[PDB]
Design a protein around this ligand. Structure first.
Ligand SMILES: [K+]
Ligand SMILES: [K+]
Ligand SMILES: [K+]
Ligand SMILES: [K+]
Ligand SMILES: [K+]
Ligand SMILES: [K+]
Ligand SMILES: [K+]
Ligand SMILES: [K+]
Ligand SMILES: [K+]
Ligand SMILES: [K+]
Ligand SMILES: [Mg+2]
Ligand SMILES: [Mg+2]
Ligand SMILES: [Mg+2]
Ligand SMILES: [Mg+2]
Ligand SMILES: [Mg+2]
Ligand SMILES: [Mg+2]
Ligand SMILES: [Mg+2]
Ligand SMILES: [Mg+2]
Ligand SMILES: [Mg+2]
Ligand SMILES: [Mg+2]
Ligand SMILES: [Mg+2]
Ligand SMILES: [Mg+2]
Ligand SMILES: [Mg+2]
Ligand SMILES: [Mg+2]
Ligand SMILES: [Mg+2]
Ligand SMILES: [Mg+2]
Ligand SMILES: [Mg+2]
Ligand SMILES: [Mg+2]
Ligand SMILES: [Mg+2]
Ligand SMILES: [Mg+2]
Ligand SMILES: [Mg+2]
Ligand SMILES: [Mg+2]
Ligand SMILES: [Mg+2]
Ligand SMILES: [Mg+2]
Ligand SMILES: [Mg+2]
Ligand SMILES: [Mg+2]
Ligand SMILES: [Mg+2]
Ligand SMILES: [Mg+2]
Ligand SMILES: [Mg+2]
Ligand SMILES: [Mg+2]
Ligand SMILES: [Mg+2]
Ligand SMILES: [Mg+2]
Ligand SMILES: [Mg+2]
Ligand SMILES: [Mg+2]
Ligand SMILES: [Mg+2]
Ligand SMILES: [Mg+2]
Ligand SMILES: [Mg+2]
Ligand SMILES: [Mg+2]
Ligand SMILES: [Mg+2]
Ligand SMILES: [Mg+2]
Lengths: 254, 243
RNA sequence: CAGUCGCGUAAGCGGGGCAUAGGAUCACAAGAUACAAAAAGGAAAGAUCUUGGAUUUUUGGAAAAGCUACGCUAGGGAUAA
RNA sequence: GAUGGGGUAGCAGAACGUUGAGUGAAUCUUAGAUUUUUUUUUUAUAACUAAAUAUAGAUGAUAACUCAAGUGAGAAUGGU
RNA sequence: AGACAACACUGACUAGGAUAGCUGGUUUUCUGCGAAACCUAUAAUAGUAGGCAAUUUAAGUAACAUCUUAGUAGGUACAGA
RNA sequence: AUGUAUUAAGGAGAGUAUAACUUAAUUUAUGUUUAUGAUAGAGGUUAUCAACAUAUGAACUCUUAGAGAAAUUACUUAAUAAACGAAGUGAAUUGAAAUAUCUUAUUAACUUCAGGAAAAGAAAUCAAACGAGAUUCUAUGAUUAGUGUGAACGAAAAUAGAGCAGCCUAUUAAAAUAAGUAAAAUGGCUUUAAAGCUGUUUGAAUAUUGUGGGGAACCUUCCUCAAAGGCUAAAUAUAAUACAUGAGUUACAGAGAAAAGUACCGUGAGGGAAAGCUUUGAAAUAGUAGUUUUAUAAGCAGCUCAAGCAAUAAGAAAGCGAGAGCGUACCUUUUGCAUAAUGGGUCACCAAGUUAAUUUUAGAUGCGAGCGAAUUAGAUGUGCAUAGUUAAACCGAUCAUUAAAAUAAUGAAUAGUGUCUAAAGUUAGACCCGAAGCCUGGUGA
């Protein structure tokens, strides 16, 4: 079939409420280990600083006088004191600050993004949910936090305990690998819950996700609007002349 | 195990690295494939050096010159214009102007000094169109008209072609009129546009004027001639008879 | 092959000499071609074709004299006593 | 019952090792991780078994795959 | 006296800025193939370029080598005057 | 190392509570918050058991009045380093395989002047018949146009980005619109022959009602600008301090400097170290111990054959080895080296085809007559290819020579583009080490 279904869940209880449809060229591509390699390695070269520096014989401090006469001493003839053959000499072919980043076609970088997103789909590690994807922390704790009654060491010790037991029930915690939450914007509860308890997973903003982040944890929990906005920006090879992008098959029973 | 620990490029994409000066068994140990104590081992030999013998470009000399004033036309054939109309990528009912030829991708992305319509595959062209280009071959002008079309060669430049695609200039198949009896109509038309459009240039040199001033090329200045007058600004058609 | 000349009844012959020993480019000079002409009309200076003036004789083509025992450096048993 | 087997200059192919990096908030470790040694085995520039000595729960070590090089020294009247 | 001018003077010391067609050195393993010291040119002869031609792996082969049979070019050994 | 923020004169001598810094070398006060902070006690030397913010007393001598042998004299409310900037002057090594023009290079260096930056700057600019609209910095354009015998040198328009600001009534106080000027000849600079700078000798005109300058020899028309008068922030250069980041360093590394321009060397200019910690303890080397062999023998000390010794004990032989034979180190450089040719006392460590831009090839792979990039509505950002031919344009599936043309003759036609891995050509130190010498500025009798 040309299109593949996408079931939308309610994050708290994981209840299938809606059904969307995407093209097979979005979440059902073949696993190309050579394309994911070029994209994963293309991102590592960009995050690299590449500022290492070393001094050559022309940059090492000191004078450029001849150390000893050309001949007559019985020792090996020598020139300047900064030669690589000296103690404090400079490294000939040493490192220098340069640009380690490489290039990658926009179409190939988008195919790797949609290839990494289909690898999670066919394996069941892509769990899309409705909007408002945030940890449903207890109301009592939320009221005390705002009140200021709870000290920092208590406000943090509780979140770490809640997120831990909440992920163990869902089988999404450190036991079953980890889980990555991808939202459109930054949410206080979600991003704060995993900042104190990161062993259970992590949270990322749609603009902060990379091809490598979609292949690191056990599952990828992404929002409905975030996913559509993710494929709509990484389908250059497709949109050139459209294909099903978020076509709703089963509407939410309001 | 993990996906990130099982990714790699195709085997045929990797190649052997030659690190010289790293032992005899590697194959490039001592001299690193340089030889034994020569100029090519101690220093560098110039690329243009032939041992001292005079090169051929000196014994023969350089031939010709590079024309820096020639226009770099973007060629367009009829077989490629027919394929675009059949694919719905060029509307034949509307005038086919450089703006519609450049944005359609038929001549590519680069914008050159002009567009010339060539007549490759002229026997299979039977679509009536109204095209406008900078030049056109004799075999393409008759093919466009044999099918029931109209062709007019206008004067363009590399800059005026960019303004036609950017919308900063409106396309017109007529030159700027001359005389005090046209200022009223020309000035009145500019005001109604409500936008500052750049005018398309007209030919200024002798050769350029003579090109668009003759009917063989369907130049947009050919209407300024008489049935007997010649396009050349200097030569005239001699008279026949005995006198 | 085309062009157009000579000789020969004709067939045909003729793109120098019975054969094997005359250096370029650049620059310069004389003719032709109508190519391009830095706003434009011209021009200049260029380009193509033909042709001339050379012990460029170290003749694949630098405008070029010696001493060192006051001598120096890099090298050679690739080379003498 | 396949064919082939010396090698300088030189050309080409395939690998190991070293340093750091990613998977890694991973795996393992007083029921001994790690210990510059010794020993044992395997077609073996490497790793492995055991032994002896000391005692670490991570500023420890680590397979596999991949990434990047200040990556491999009996030879320079070489340098410390 | 090419004498002296603070280790140096046929031109000191010191800082800054070189080249070296020359000599020396160039670090792990396995595997496959495998030369040349000749010709031509060169202010060129211990240098370099172009060839012959080593290597890689693709497409071709009426390829290449060798013998057989038939044929051709050319004047050496020898022999002769 | 880079980036960001802030800042715009630097050092020395001697002395002093040896964390406390200037003969006052640990001054004296204010405000707030103080464990829900900030990022109901003890303690004035058995001290500073309080952080933040705003004030405050003190702060010597020399560089630095005059003199002198700087830190002295004698006086006195005496006081400004370097780097960066503009102008002036201006080489040589080097490359051209020599070398004069050229290149190196409007470089280094030196001199003057100036500020926290300076300079430059709102067109007598570029464009080309359409238009842009000051200066400055970065990239593309561009191994281009072009010059040069060569070697090589080398723009502008335009584009993108950083900043953006215009004016004379200049947010600092200036013009009655510029004459020995524009320009010419000549000698030079720069450069493409124009334009620009300039010594010498000469020497104009008065606004589109077309006067003047420019548009790359030159003339003409047109276009464009309006010299001989001025002001102007930002983006930029350098230094200092702070902070952020790191497939940067972790002690022969990183800055020369983990206590450093100190010790030490030199008359001097100047040159210029070593040295971390409580952990680990390799190799060489030295004195011994265990096993084993050795005082009749001519070993690059290894290899082949191998008696014997060697475990208190059931089992278990690593090692040393008499004796027999074979074997003249290694590397470099050479026609050829055990060579009495070169290099090494041993061991450990440092120590050599790398990076950047540019131009290619192969393989792999994405797209595909397009590729790449970049992008409520619109537009914008190099490039390569898609058509060939010629010295070149016109021309064009045809084109060029044939001085008219013409299947008369001859040649030339169909997948590109981006990325990665690797090998490479080119310019940069360019695989590493090494001259004698040349030039510039300083030092010393
Ligand atoms: K050598
Ligand atoms: K002209
Ligand atoms: K030589
Ligand atoms: K072999
Ligand atoms: K062989
Ligand atoms: K004969
Ligand atoms: K050129
Ligand atoms: K001039
Ligand atoms: K002015
Ligand atoms: K190395
Ligand atoms: Mg010197
Ligand atoms: Mg160093
Ligand atoms: Mg890479
Ligand atoms: Mg070899
Ligand atoms: Mg080689
Ligand atoms: Mg090679
Ligand atoms: Mg050689
Ligand atoms: Mg000769
Ligand atoms: Mg010859
Ligand atoms: Mg004498
Ligand atoms: Mg000899
Ligand atoms: Mg054999
Ligand atoms: Mg041990
Ligand atoms: Mg490193
Ligand atoms: Mg050594
Ligand atoms: Mg004498
Ligand atoms: Mg003397
Ligand atoms: Mg031979
Ligand atoms: Mg010569
Ligand atoms: Mg004084
Ligand atoms: Mg004083
Ligand atoms: Mg530029
Ligand atoms: Mg020459
Ligand atoms: Mg004026
Ligand atoms: Mg003047
Ligand atoms: Mg002029
Ligand atoms: Mg002037
Ligand atoms: Mg002109
Ligand atoms: Mg150090
Ligand atoms: Mg250490
Ligand atoms: Mg030891
Ligand atoms: Mg005996
Ligand atoms: Mg010899
Ligand atoms: Mg020896
Ligand atoms: Mg020796
Ligand atoms: Mg030693
Ligand atoms: Mg070390
Ligand atoms: Mg090393
Ligand atoms: Mg290869
Ligand atoms: Mg073309």
């Amino acid at each position: 079939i040309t299109n593949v279904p996408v079931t939308v869940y309610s994050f708290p209880e994981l209840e299938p409420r809606s059904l969307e449809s995407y093209s097979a060229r979005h979440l059902h591509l073949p696993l190309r280990r050579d394309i994911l390699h070029l994209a994963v390695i293309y991102e590592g070269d960009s995050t690299r600083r590449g500022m290492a520096s070393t001094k050559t014989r022309y940059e090492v401090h000191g004078s450029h006088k001849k150390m000893s006469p050309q001949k007559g001493t019985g020792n090996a003839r020598r020139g300047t004191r900064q030669s690589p053959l000296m103690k404090g000499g400079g490294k000939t072919f040493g490192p220098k600050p340069r640009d380690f980043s490489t290039k990658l076609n926009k179409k190939v970088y988008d195919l790797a993004w949609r290839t990494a997103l289909s690898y999670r789909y066919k394996r069941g590690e892509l769990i899309v949910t409705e909007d408002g994807l945030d940890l449903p922390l207890p109301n009592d704790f939320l009221w005390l936090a705002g009140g200021g009654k709870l000290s920092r060491e208590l406000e943090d010790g509780y979140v770490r305990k809640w997120v831990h037991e909440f992920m163990t029930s869902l089988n999404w915690g450190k036991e079953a690998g980890r889980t990555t939450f991808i939202t459109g914007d930054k949410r206080p509860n979600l991003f704060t819950g995993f900042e104190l308890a990161g062993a259970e997973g992590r949270a990322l903003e749609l603009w902060d996700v990379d091809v490598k982040d979609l292949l690191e944890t056990g599952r990828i929990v992404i929002e409905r609007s975030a996913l559509k906005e993710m494929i709509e920006d990484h389908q250059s090879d497709l949109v050139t002349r459209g294909p099903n992008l978020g076509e709703v098959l089963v509407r939410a029973p309001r | 195990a993990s996906i990130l620990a099982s990714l790699s490029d195709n085997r045929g994409a990797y190649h052997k690295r030659i690190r010289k000066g790293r032992g005899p068994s590697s194959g490039y140990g001592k001299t690193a494939g340089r030889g034994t104590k020569g100029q090519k081992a101690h220093g560098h030999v110039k690329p243009w050096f032939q041992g001292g013998q005079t090169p051929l470009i000196v014994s023969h000399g350089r031939k010709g010159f590079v024309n820096q004033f020639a226009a770099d036309m973007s060629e367009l054939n009829l077989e490629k214009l027919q394929e675009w109309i059949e694919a719905g990528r060029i509307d034949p009912t509307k005038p086919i102007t450089p703006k519609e030829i450049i944005k359609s991708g038929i001549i590519g992305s680069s914008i050159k000094d002009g567009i010339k319509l060539l007549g490759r595959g002229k026997e299979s062209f039977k679509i009536p169109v109204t095209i406008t280009v900078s030049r056109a071959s004799a075999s393409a002008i008759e093919a466009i008209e044999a099918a029931g079309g109209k062709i007019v060669t206008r004067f363009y430049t590399k800059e005026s072609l960019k303004r036609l695609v950017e919308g900063k200039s409106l396309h017109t198949d007529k030159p700027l009129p001359v005389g005090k009896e046209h200022v009223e109509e020309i000035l009145a038309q500019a005001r109604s546009l409500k936008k500052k459009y750049y005018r398309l240039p007209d030919p200024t040199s002798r050769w350029d004027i003579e090109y668009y001033r003759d009917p063989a090329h369907r130049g947009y200045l050919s209407h300024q001639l008489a049935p007997g007058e010649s396009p050349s600004l200097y030569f005239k058609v001699p008279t026949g008879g005995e006198k």
